[PDB]
Structure 1
Amino acid sequence: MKETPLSNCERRFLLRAIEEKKRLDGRQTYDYRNIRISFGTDYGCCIVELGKTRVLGQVSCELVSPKLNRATEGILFFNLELSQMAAPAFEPGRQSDLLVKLNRLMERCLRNSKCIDTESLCVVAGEKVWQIRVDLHLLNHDGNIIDAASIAAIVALCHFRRPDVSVQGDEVTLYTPEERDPVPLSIHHMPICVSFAFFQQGTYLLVDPNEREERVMDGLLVIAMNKHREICTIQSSGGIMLLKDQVLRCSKIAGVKVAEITELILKALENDQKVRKEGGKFGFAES
């Protein structure tokens, strides 16, 4: 198949409405869309939908022989798939550039920022360690992914629980979720990306761009942040010439945005725990 071409009418109208600082749906430039965080029945599943963009996230575990360079700390395996239901162009093995950049960015952001404790999840140093993989799947594609993918990975890795294990010497004993209560993970800080889109070589900048705004933009600035104001990654794509003050301002924005998103995530987890502590296999949060 193929994506429908973009008419000059829409392009010019968008550029003008930007010049005049007018978005389409009716929001400002420094605003996200209503993001909803919904949970599943199995610890580790989360569907996060911002506006029209829905993304699914599952977290699974295994025990495996670690790699020699790091025989003490475990492993972590990201993967993001762009399901053909996200959009027509997403045939298998065709839109590889987008996959590559997204996956490298997400790996970098979460792994190298040391968001979780790869050490806590050791069982037998040299023989058996955990292996936590996280599979994100793109269901609907309307605009901003990285933010959605990240919020999903984070809600999952904070809403996941391992099968408890006992150990003595080399004797390792795994157990079932019914015999004991699974144990959660160990996070230090939850980073979530923030996407800025540049229009007219750098003059205008938007937040949470829709799909059209992504088609008539020249540049994309991703910025990862925490609630403690700690840059984890920043990336520029699209072949665009920005400056210093622009990234400084974008960072001062990402600060507030990430603080708010984090408050929401925490509220969501609280509500989900409350529900399961009352009978109910769901959990729901709204921006």
Structure 2
Amino acid sequence: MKETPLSNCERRFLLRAIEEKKRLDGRQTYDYRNIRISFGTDYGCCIVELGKTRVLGQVSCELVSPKLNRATEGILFFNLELSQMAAPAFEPGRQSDLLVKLNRLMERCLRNSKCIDTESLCVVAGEKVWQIRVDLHLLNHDGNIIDAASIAAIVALCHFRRPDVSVQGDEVTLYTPEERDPVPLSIHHMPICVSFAFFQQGTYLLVDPNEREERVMDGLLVIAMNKHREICTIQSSGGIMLLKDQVLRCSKIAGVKVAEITELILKALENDQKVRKEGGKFGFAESIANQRITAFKMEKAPXXXXXXXXXXXXXXXXXXXXXXXXXXXXXXXXXXXXXX
């Protein structure tokens, strides 16, 4: 669609300022923009905000017939989608280079960590196993994705709720009324993404680049570290001179961050759990719903409701009544003689 243009000075100076080890959005070299997380009305729903980049996480529940081979550990699927409204240039279909690399790239560390059990879901191995699909929707697109992208999922993955009531012998039955209790998951390990942007021979290194940054950076690296201070995946891109040595701090540094980042999931993951059990308040996001301006919520009454409902005859009778007699004519027009 519309190509988001890009000045010269803008870029150049944007860098000029990196040479300054000064962040334009005025932060420090290894910090994250604040990231927020809102939970959905229903369970298995979430929204992430890496501060301007927004992701959508939804997980699914199914009783599919596992695959051939190891018909003993059910399968799972995830998908990441890039929206139109995502970026301007995001007309559905073309950006593959991202949706390719990224979708797969992301999806890599998922089966990499196997942080997700595949037999606990499996009810009747060989016959009926569970299929859990997870979908990612890039709402807005500003700077570092894959990270909110990961958070999105992980953050999401922990909130979903699988149903189950009673299945004995070779029969399966589940009732939402009994489902009012059993509905959890197998989140063994939780891995996250940490990208590192490079600048001019990686003689400068940034973390969680914003959109503008995103552009200026020559080469970028990602990392995957599960709570257990260990990796799952790394990826080098944008072609650079990545000295095994330096490759080493980032790796480190990434761990450093994954640390705190987790905190939140759990942190809020808890805060959420709390509300359902107390006062109560599911929804999408009342926070943006109360903060002054650009948003409003109120509830209004429905005897204006039934008062006019009788008027229907007035318009229904006045008009159609005289309109029904033309039928006597249509009876004979094309039907009678068409016998040919």
Give the Å deviation of 1:112: 1.9
Asked whether the 8 Å contact 2:163–2:179 carries over to 1, the reply is: no
Give the Å deviation of 1:5: 2.5
Please list the CA deviations of residues 195-228 of structure 1 after superposition, one character each: whole Å capped at 9, or x if unmatched.
1001102211100001111111111101011222
Please list the CA deviations of residues 214-271 of structure 1 after superposition, one character each: whole Å capped at 9, or x if unmatched.
1111111010112221100000111222111222100111112111011111011111
Give the Å deviation of 1:30: 0.6
Task: Describe the shift of the 1:7–1:286 C-alpha distance in structure 2 as closer, same or farther (beyond 3 A).
Answer: farther
- Residues in 2 aligned to 1:282 and 1:254: alpha-carbon distance in whole angstroms: 33
Where do 1:99-178 residues align within 5 Å? 99-176=99-176
1:251 aligned residue: 251
Please list the CA deviations of residues 76-133 of structure 1 after superposition, one character each: whole Å capped at 9, or x if unmatched.
1111111111111111111111001111111111122111111110011111110000
In terms of fraction of residues, the more strand-rich structure is: 1
In terms of fraction of residues, the more helix-rich structure is: 2
Asked whether the 8 Å contact 2:222–2:236 carries over to 1, the reply is: yes
- Residues in 2 aligned to 1:117 and 1:281: alpha-carbon distance in whole angstroms: 31
Q: Which runs of 5+ in 1 are unaligned?
A: none
Which stretch shows the higher mean deviation, 250-259 or 169-178?
Answer: 169-178
Give the Å deviation of 1:36: 0.3
Give the Å deviation of 1:177: 5.2
Task: Describe the shift of the 1:44–1:228 C-alpha distance in structure 2 as closer, same or farther (beyond 3 A).
Answer: same
Task: Describe the shift of the 1:180–1:276 C-alpha distance in structure 2 as closer, same or farther (beyond 3 A).
Answer: closer
Where do 1:194-213 residues align within 5 Å? 194-213=194-213
2:325 aligned residue: none
Asked whether the 8 Å contact 1:37–1:285 carries over to 2, the reply is: no
Asked whether the 8 Å contact 1:35–1:286 carries over to 2, the reply is: no
Asked whether the 8 Å contact 1:264–1:285 carries over to 2, the reply is: no
Give the Å deviation of 1:286: 14
Which stretch shows the higher mean deviation, 209-218 or 163-172?
Answer: 163-172
- Residues in 2 aligned to 1:8 and 1:143: alpha-carbon distance in whole angstroms: 19
RCO higher in 1 or 2 (8 Å CA, sep ≥ 6)? 1
Asked whether the 8 Å contact 1:36–1:284 carries over to 2, the reply is: no
- Residues in 2 aligned to 1:251 and 1:186: alpha-carbon distance in whole angstroms: 27
Q: Secondary structure at the match of 1:168?
A: coil
Task: Describe the shift of the 1:284–1:248 C-alpha distance in structure 2 as closer, same or farther (beyond 3 A).
Answer: farther
Give the Å deviation of 1:282: 3.6
- Residues in 1 aligned to 2:285 and 2:201: alpha-carbon distance in whole angstroms: 37
- Residues in 2 aligned to 1:285 and 1:151: alpha-carbon distance in whole angstroms: 18
- Residues in 1 aligned to 2:248 and 2:284: alpha-carbon distance in whole angstroms: 34
Q: Select the structure of larger CA radius of gyration.
A: 2
Give the Å deviation of 1:149: 1.1
- Residues in 2 aligned to 1:35 and 1:150: alpha-carbon distance in whole angstroms: 13
Q: Secondary structure at the match of 1:89?
A: coil
Asked whether the 8 Å contact 2:53–2:140 carries over to 1, the reply is: yes
Please list the CA deviations of residues 1-37 of structure 1 after superposition, one character each: whole Å capped at 9, or x if unmatched.
1322311101111111111101111100010010001
- Residues in 2 aligned to 1:142 and 1:238: alpha-carbon distance in whole angstroms: 18
Give the Å deviation of 1:280: 2.2
Please list the CA deviations of residues 138-196 of structure 1 after superposition, one character each: whole Å capped at 9, or x if unmatched.
11100011111110101111011111142222122222156542321011121110010
Asked whether the 8 Å contact 2:48–2:148 carries over to 1, the reply is: yes
1:186 aligned residue: 186
Asked whether the 8 Å contact 1:163–1:177 carries over to 2, the reply is: no
- Residues in 2 aligned to 1:68 and 1:179: alpha-carbon distance in whole angstroms: 30
- Residues in 1 aligned to 2:286 and 2:229: alpha-carbon distance in whole angstroms: 24
Task: Describe the shift of the 1:270–1:203 C-alpha distance in structure 2 as closer, same or farther (beyond 3 A).
Answer: same
Q: Which runs of 5+ in 2 are unaligned?
A: 288-340
Runs of 4+ in 1 over 6 A off after TM superposition: 283-287
Asked whether the 8 Å contact 2:41–2:283 carries over to 1, the reply is: no
1:21 aligned residue: 21
Q: TM-score scaled by structure 2?
A: 0.81
Asked whether the 8 Å contact 1:142–1:211 carries over to 2, the reply is: yes
**Number of aligned pairs?**
287
Q: TM-score scaled by structure 1?
A: 0.95
Asked whether the 8 Å contact 2:41–2:284 carries over to 1, the reply is: no
- Residues in 2 aligned to 1:279 and 1:30: alpha-carbon distance in whole angstroms: 38
Task: Describe the shift of the 1:283–1:103 C-alpha distance in structure 2 as closer, same or farther (beyond 3 A).
Answer: same
- Residues in 1 aligned to 2:135 and 2:215: alpha-carbon distance in whole angstroms: 27
Give the Å deviation of 1:285: 11
